[PDB]
Amino acid sequence: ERGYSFSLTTFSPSGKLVQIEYALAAVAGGAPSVGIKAANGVVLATEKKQKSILYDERSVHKVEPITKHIGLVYSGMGPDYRVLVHRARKLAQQYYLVYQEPIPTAQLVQRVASVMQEYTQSGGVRPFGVSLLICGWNEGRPYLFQSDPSGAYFAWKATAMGKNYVNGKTFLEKRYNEDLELEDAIHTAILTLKESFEGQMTEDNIEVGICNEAGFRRLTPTEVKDYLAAIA
Amino acid sequence: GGRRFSEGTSADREIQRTLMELLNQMDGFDTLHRVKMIMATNRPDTLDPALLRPGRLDRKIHIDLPNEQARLDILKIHAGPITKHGEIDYEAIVKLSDGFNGADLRNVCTEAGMFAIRADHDFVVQEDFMKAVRKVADSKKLESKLDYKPV
Amino acid sequence: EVKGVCTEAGMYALRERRVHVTQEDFEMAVAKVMQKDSEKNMSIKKLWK
Amino acid sequence: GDLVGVNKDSYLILETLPTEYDSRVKAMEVDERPTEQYSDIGGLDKQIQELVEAIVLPMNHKEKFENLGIQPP
Amino acid sequence: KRFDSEKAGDREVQRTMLELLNQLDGFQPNTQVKVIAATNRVDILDPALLRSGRLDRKIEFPMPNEEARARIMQIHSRKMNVSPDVNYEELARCTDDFNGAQCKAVCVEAGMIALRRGATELTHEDYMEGILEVQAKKKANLQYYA
Amino acid sequence: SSAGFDRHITIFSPEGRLYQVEYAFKAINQGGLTSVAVRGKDCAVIVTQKKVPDKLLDSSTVTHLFKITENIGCVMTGMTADSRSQVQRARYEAANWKYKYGYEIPVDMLCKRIADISQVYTQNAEMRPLGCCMILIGIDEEQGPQVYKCDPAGYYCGFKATAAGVKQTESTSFLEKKVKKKFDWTFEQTVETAITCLSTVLSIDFKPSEIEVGVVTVENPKFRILTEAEIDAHLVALAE
Amino acid sequence: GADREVQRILLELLNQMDGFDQNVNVKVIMATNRADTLDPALLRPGRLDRKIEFPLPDRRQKRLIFSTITSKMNLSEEVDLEDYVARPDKISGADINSICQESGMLAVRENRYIVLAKDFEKAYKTVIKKDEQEHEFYK
């Protein structure tokens, strides 16, 4: 490059930022996803489709692990997702080289959102088009956080993103209670993902990852075929 | 026609109202019977999609210029009733021509008629056609940005 | 909009052929009328705190 | 579209009234063209002929262009 | 140069352009009246009426030569009293980048310059003064250039 | 609509889209070429025609079938100048896998490294996003054959049989009708379908001089470009 | 002197829409293409209450529309339309009618009266040549 470095995101005359609001529009028209925190573990459930019978499902993965106990899904766009995965992978290593201890889940999200915000103020680039759902069972209590293209973190009990997320939002508002078990959380997570799905819900149309206090665990399609018997 | 849009210099508001009248009257609440409509243009790129939607304009059809045998057939049509001797190399006329237009091959049949009336000839020779194309070939190539981009 | 909620809660009880109304009838009635372009999303209004 | 003469009482059509129009093209009618000798033009005599071949012979030889099988431009 | 909807010349021109075009060939044959229409610019036109059917006899106007301009100046000088010792080689050599309007304009000025001093004749000196009076000696020393 | 400079540089639209990248998807179609990839049970076929407009032009320096490593080949569509720039990147990062890690690079991991680079060109706004496609083949240990496709947006996935180029929606529609009927796939069963799909979509029924076949096999993992004679041998064999 | 005439029509409309008489036992129905364009004083409840959207017909409605058109059509005995139901590239309702007409106009043309399940494929390929796919990017 040359030395331009001019930020292409400035304030509106109203006083809002324009490109971040447009980046949120790309997230809302993405694949639906749901995450539920249920007092012994946290369950991530995304919704994976294939436009043909020609694609392969053992290749592209949505639920992606980070350390040994920290999972991560998204709802926005695809190529930008893999960037900040590899960024967060290295970002958890400088914690572990220095402190010799697995990084707490709150400590990642402070660092990932700091990457993402500082990315928007600098010049020549667009913001990301990805929102995240990060979870983990650190120090007894499990956790569930959500980031955004603006770079703001939250702490949900149960949220949803992607298409028709407000419909899934009201559904969890009646479905979720003070506490459940892990298996009940999986049963209501498939229930809310079956809200806006299509007719074929096989072991390949959904893709589910959990966080035990024993650790992160990604579910193979065998159990998801077995657990979808009398689903929702 | 054209596309609807936002705040648009109030002259344009009328033409959208004229267009909305046309969309309603030819296909709306009433039943248009024994009536057929032939629309013809060159820029079908940006219109109202409510105008191009089927039911009112069912089958659109594209009409292409080059076939290399059509330009042979267009040439035989326009040079049908012309006095000559049959010494007409149509293939070299077809090969050397960038006419691309039945009006242009009408113009080529006009030009070779103009050279033939020069030097007092009732018949038309093949060289008149070779002068007819080169006048056509020069007249077109003295132009720039001659775009031909539809939908 | 108070009238619209009263009409929608009335219309929901009509199709059930019922002269009674619940609290939930109004909850789905307000959610019908509250249909705006400034969508909720939790991220439009929390990034600006 | 004709401007016929009408009786004021019987309303009968009896006249033709040669039907003028707007004054703007009336202002565009320029007659009495002065004869300019072609030799006033220098160096452009080929274009003069190609014009005279294009227009004047269609004006004169109306039937030479009809029996040949062509149409004047 | 059509398909361009940009303010303000996007609406008022294209119909009058079209109502021209659909009048020229159009639907019914118009073999009653001839059109000899002329421009001074080619490429700005869109290829809509620009093809054959309509205006197809492209008559380029070349730049007038030294021999063309010297011929033209001799024509406009014919109506006045001119001394016969006028070299057209010098005139064609000194006249550069003129047209028929500008070759006429020098010939009017060189006669009026001769009207000022009261002679009844002309020389090459009059026309050189007539040439210099056209542009009125365009020379600004931009002074950057050595 | 268009806000700011969303038609020009890689920023967002008010509709939550962008436009430069989806212009680049139909920057392939100015190439005027169609390539088909089919994976069988123990092979992986790449087939691609070539157009030779001039007799004064070689029949050697034309074919898009390139060789990344000794066990990985590819095919390029789109424009040609952007294609060979893409290939030198793939040749370069395959060798760095050897020098850093020691073993041969998998065909899956290479498509990540390519799609990351295409991401960045989308990402920073002051550079062009390189419109050309990418299809790889290769044999993995304890995984069999693979077929992948990088895109100028920056995403990839595995496939079973997937074409690219100009004609996909007729070519992929035929391959779906071929796969879902659950037939056998051995070697020549896989090669014959890779011809007849490209035969029926293009509707040519050609002479064995335009297409090139780049099969890789489990028994012979070397990337191999077929001879014109044996290309003619398969074509008359499927002919009844 | 034209935007004032449109504006006074709106004010005249809303007065006798809802003024001092609230004219009983009449109903007003409107049907435009874009509703984010018109006046926000029109969309208020108590003046217009039913904000009915007509979206594009999805799957499970194509089977409804195909059933109703071909209830009147004398088509083939053993053609199935189900391959052309799960298709992408969303299709408006009037397109289905055009496909059915374009099939029949092709069915007449070779002096026939019934369907051989090839004219439907031509009509489907005919009507679809437009701009297309979601590009499998940003999901």
Place this chain on the structure above:
Amino acid sequence: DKSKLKPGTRVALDMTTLTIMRYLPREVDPLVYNMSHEDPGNVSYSEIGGLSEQIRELREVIELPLTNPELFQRVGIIPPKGCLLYGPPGTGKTLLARAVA
């Protein structure tokens, strides 16, 4: 025949008696009179070349409803309205309107 006097028809009143003399069907508006009366070309599908695929397809949808609707009975399906002649210029698109007229 007062049953024909439909509320919205047009009549001719007497000048003095003012009563109805003769009813008149419609108006013409001599503006659009000029868009009716003109000759196309007396052309006969023979002043056109290389287009018989497009021509026969176009004639199929126009001629058949205005001539023989019994084929459309035997199918049942209603015929559609019309076509669009889009094309880059000079291809001969106004020449077809001569032919059908």
Place this chain on the structure above:
Amino acid sequence: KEIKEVIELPVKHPELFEALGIAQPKGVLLYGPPGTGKTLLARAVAHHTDCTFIRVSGSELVQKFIGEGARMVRELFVMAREHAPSIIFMDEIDSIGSSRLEGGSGGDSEVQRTMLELLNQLDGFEATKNIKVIMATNRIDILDSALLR
């Protein structure tokens, strides 16, 4: 409470306002953008007042050709002064009353004469009495500001 004691209080007890030394108000503007209490509050005060109520929408005075739409302006107020216990109601003064534009370009000066007449009748000649006007429209940024002093 503001409207009741700006309308019924000048009527029922005018001697109070004639005792301080200042004059009684006659001009009321109501505005609310979504239409909240813009007719109900009008029809209620039209109900329990025992006073004459005149409602004229600001869209009727337009009349086809010239002058006729202007002459009935003064013909209204002389009827309004004919019954001194009366209130004129205006409905949606937004079109007639926008802005005095140019005359050769758009902004046709035909309804402008009525706005000139309306402003110069109530206070152009004599300050009348027992006449209360009520104007109800939203959009208080687009109508004219001379009647807003």
